[PDB]
């Protein structure tokens, strides 16, 4: 055990209420510039900031007990124990599996969402790759 389980660029599965376990990457919050913090300053309530792979940019502060290191798509079955949501999730898994073969510096440069004030936008490199 380590007190700081994840760092910026780490790939993780995150669990948010109403959604299945989703592929993510730990990242710095646009406003705070931090990637980890204690909710209400309780040492047992550590959270990490993550961005979700998939269709549209999304991010969240998540409790460390709702995160699991991402090794691969095959973990999903053991972790558990829908139309538009399924296609978004599949797209996210393809991106996460591509990011897993990259170095941490390359995966941060390619996948980190573009921050324009408090608006989250596609990474210009991902946008160019998709022909946007
Ligand atoms: C883009 N956001 C959304 O689809 C929805 C509606 C607003 C909040 N939200 C949301 N918030 C959170 C915190 C997570 C989350 N997911 C896990 C699903 C999305 C991840 C990126 S995706 O592939 O586009 C689908 N979804």
UniProtKB/Swiss-Prot annotation:
Q: Where is the PWWP domain?
A: 8-72
Tissue expression remark = Widely expressed. Predominantly expressed in thymus and testis.
Indicate the span of the full protein covered: 215 to 365 of 1365
The family line of this record is: Belongs to the class V-like SAM-binding methyltransferase superfamily. Histone-lysine methyltransferase family. SET2 subfamily.
The name under which this protein is listed is Histone-lysine N-methyltransferase NSD2
State how it assembles: Interacts with HDAC1. Interacts (via PHD-type zinc fingers 1, 2 and 3) with SALL1. Interacts (via PHD-type 1, 2 and 3) with SALL4. Interacts with NANOG. Interacts with OGT. Interacts (via HMG box) with NKX2-5.
Per UniProt, subcellular location reads as: Nucleus; Chromosome
Q: What does this protein do?
A: Histone methyltransferase which specifically dimethylates nucleosomal histone H3 at 'Lys-36' (H3K36me2). Also monomethylates nucleosomal histone H3 at 'Lys-36' (H3K36me) in vitro. Does not trimethylate nucleosomal histone H3 at 'Lys-36' (H3K36me3). However, specifically trimethylates histone H3 at 'Lys-36' (H3K36me3) at euchromatic regions in embryonic stem (ES) cells. By methylating histone H3 at 'Lys-36', involved in the regulation of gene transcription during various biological processes.
Q: What is the lineage of its organism?
A: Eukaryota, Metazoa, Chordata, Craniata, Vertebrata
Q: Which organism is it from?
A: Homo sapiens (Human)
Pathology noted in the entry:
Rauch-Steindl syndrome: An autosomal dominant disorder characterized by poor pre- and postnatal growth, facial dysmorphism, and variable developmental delay with delayed motor and speech acquisition and impaired intellectual. Other features may include hypotonia and behavioral abnormalities. A chromosomal aberration involving NSD2 is a cause of multiple myeloma tumors. Translocation t(4;14)(p16.3;q32.3) with IgH.
């Amino acid at each position: 055990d380590h007190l700081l389980k994840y760092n910026v660029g780490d790939l993780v599965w995150s669990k948010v209420s109403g959604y299945p376990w989703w592929p993510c990457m730990v990242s710095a919050d646009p406003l705070l510039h931090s990637y980890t913090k204690l909710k209400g300053q309780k040492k047992s309530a550590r959270q990490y900031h993550v961005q979700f792979f998939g269709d549209a940019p999304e991010r969240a502060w998540i409790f460390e007990k709702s995160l699991v290191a991402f090794e691969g798509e095959g973990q999903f079955e053991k972790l558990c124990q829908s139309g538009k949501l399924r296609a978004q999730w599949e797209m996210g898994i393809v991106q996460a599996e591509e990011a897993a073969s990259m170095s941490v510096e390359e995966r941060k440069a390619k996948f980190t969402f573009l921050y324009v004030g408090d608006q989250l936008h596609l990474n210009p490199q991902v946008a160019k790759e998709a022909g946007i």
